[PDB]
Structures are given as structure tokens and as C-alpha cells.
Ligand binder design. Sequence first.
Ligand SMILES: NS(=O)(=O)c1ccc(CN(Cc2cccc(NCC(=O)O)c2)S(=O)(=O)c2ccccc2)cc1
Ligand SMILES: [Zn+2]
Length: 258
Amino acid sequence: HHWGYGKHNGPEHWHKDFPIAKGERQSPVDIDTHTAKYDPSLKPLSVSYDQATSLRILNNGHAFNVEFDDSQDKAVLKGGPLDGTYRLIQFHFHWGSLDGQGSEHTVDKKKYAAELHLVHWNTKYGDFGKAVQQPDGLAVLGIFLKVGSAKPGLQKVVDVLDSIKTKGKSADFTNFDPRGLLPESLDYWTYPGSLTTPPLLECVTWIVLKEPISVSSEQVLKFRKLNFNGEGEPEELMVDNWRPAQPLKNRQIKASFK
Ligand SMILES: NS(=O)(=O)c1ccc(CN(Cc2cccc(NCC(=O)O)c2)S(=O)(=O)c2ccccc2)cc1
Ligand SMILES: [Zn+2]
């Protein structure tokens, strides 16, 4: 009976194995746009993905991960609220069964159809596993998806999903450029939080972009054809793999923009 997004093993159950689920800096959160304060002091955000080296795509039974070579400073995130250099290790998404839900963060209680998480680790801790034990170990760049026009830079991802339908399947996924998943503006909100999946470690600086990307209904339909189950098991569509908003507690959300 391991964790997931079903009635019996979903977010409201996670605290029994992962008591930090009820902690002081859990994610996601609702971003109240009127309460978030412009912080002039946030340096520029620097997204340097020109040398990114993607390797593989994996269905992990919860989402799919696009994995990168993080054994050198190739694809890095710096600036904004961050001290030092954060290396891109993977990206993944969370999405809904319907276009009216799927994001983890919300904006004035609005749910987007999906949310992209670009996951980076602080190089001062040497490896990802050491980084997640630190309060400043990770920086996750979160990007909302709305349904409208297709995202050209997403299609290579969409077209490989048939080959990783079930849990534990992977495929080679070289030469994929994550710059094709960014919106025009890098205006953002930031706050200290957590992983949104078990083990729910309180190690993340969240950087949530204001501007959503547009994807087509055909693109998100292909996400919803993935499976949570393994091969030769009853089909469970991979949908609604999002944690709802958690209490803000003693946190302030800062805006990079006036
Ligand atoms: N949603 S999010 O952006 O907050 C976020 C969530 C989860 C992760 C990473 N995963 C869990 C993890 C966490 C800690 C240690 C280890 N291993 C220790 C080691 O590498 O020695 C693994 S996962 O299994 O790839 C994964 C699971 C579900 C959906 C997506 C990714 C990163 C960011
Ligand atoms: Zn995530």
C-alpha cells in the first residue's frame, strides 16, 4: 500500500508515513496575488539552459521525468532569490483529468490544467541526495500550463509518451532543449517550501512564473493516456497527480515584479 493519488493512498493519507506532510513549510500553496509583496531586492533570475544535456524519459508510476546529465555545470539556475548555483537534474509535470484542474500551485484559487516543475540542486552540497537534506538544497522552477494553442517545444515530449505508457518504462531522450518550455516573461513569485511528493522534504526554494505557457488539448490528452500501473496490470490512467494547496503558515510570498 505505497503512496499515490488514489482514494486510499492519496494526499490526505501521506502524513501517516511522512509526518512532515503537516509541517511548517509545505508545498504547494495558493498564491494570493494581492498579498504577495514586490521585493525590489530580488537580484535578476538567470536560466542558463544552452548546454543542457537531456538523457532519458522515465514513467515512474507518479509522473514522467525527463532526466539531464547533472555531472557538470551545464544547465543552471541562478539569481532571483537564490545564493549560488543550482544544476538542472530533471523536469516533470502534474496534470488533471479535466482542463479545470491539474496544477499544484494556484493563483487566487485558480487551478491551471497542468504545472511543469524544473528541478535543480544546489551545487554546494555535491549531489542531489545530500541537497534534499538542506533547507536551501533545491530550487524548483514552476510553470503553469493552460489549454489553448499548441506548445511546439512540448511536442517531442508528447510524441515519446506512447513508448513509456506504464510504470518503469523508459526511453532514450537525448537532445531535448528545455528552453522550448519557457514563457516569454521570467516574472515570478517565490517562497520557501517543500517537495510536493513524498518524502515531502522541506528543502525547496520555489520560483513560480507568473506567465503560463499554452499547450493544445491534443497535447494534454496525450499526458492523460499514460498509466500509473505497470505493464500487464489493470489500466489506471495517470491523471490528477497533483497535491492540493497546503497551509501558508508563517511564510511570505515575494513577487519579482511591480
Ligand atoms: N514536485 S516537486 O518538484 O516538488 C519534486 C518531487 C519529487 C522529486 C524527486 N523524486 C523524489 C525524491 C526525493 C528525494 C530523494 C529521492 N531520492 C534520493 C536520491 O536521489 O538518492 C527522490 S522522484 O521520485 O523523481 C518523483 C516522484 C514523483 C513525481 C515526480 C518525481 C523532485 C521534485
Ligand atoms: Zn512536481
